[PDB]
């Protein structure tokens, strides 16, 4: 697939858009970062299923200087849903 995007959900208070990117950033490549700031949940798009995987799984079960994040699936981006594998 010569184009991907997995949407990860993520949940905190007092959020921003270049924090996630740094908690998104190593983990892989984003193509696409949306933040909602009426549900207080933040979207990351990864390119590869994988850069997900770390991320949701490392940053999943973290807690930061008071708040904690928890990441989850989301259904969006669905031009490519996410990648592909064996799902």
């Given at each position: 697939?010569?184009?991907?995007?997995?949407?990860?959900?993520?949940?905190?208070?007092?959020?921003?858009?270049?924090?996630?990117?740094?908690?998104?950033?190593?983990?892989?490549?984003?193509?696409?970062?949306?933040?909602?700031?009426?549900?207080?949940?933040?979207?990351?798009?990864?390119?590869?299923?994988?850069?997900?995987?770390?991320?949701?799984?490392?940053?999943?079960?973290?807690?930061?200087?008071?708040?904690?994040?928890?990441?989850?699936?989301?259904?969006?981006?669905?031009m490519?849903?996410a990648?592909?594998?064996?799902?």
């Open positions: 697939a010569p184009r991907k995007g997995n949407t990860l959900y993520v949940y905190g208070e007092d959020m921003t858009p270049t924090l996630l990117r740094g908690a998104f950033s190593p983990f892989g490549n984003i193509i696409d970062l949306s933040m909602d700031p009426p549900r207080n949940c933040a979207f990351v798009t990864y390119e590869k299923m994988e850069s997900a995987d770390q991320a949701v799984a490392e940053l999943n079960g973290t807690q930061v200087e008071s708040v904690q994040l928890k990441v989850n699936i989301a259904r969006k981006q669905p490519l849903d990648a592909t594998g064996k799902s």
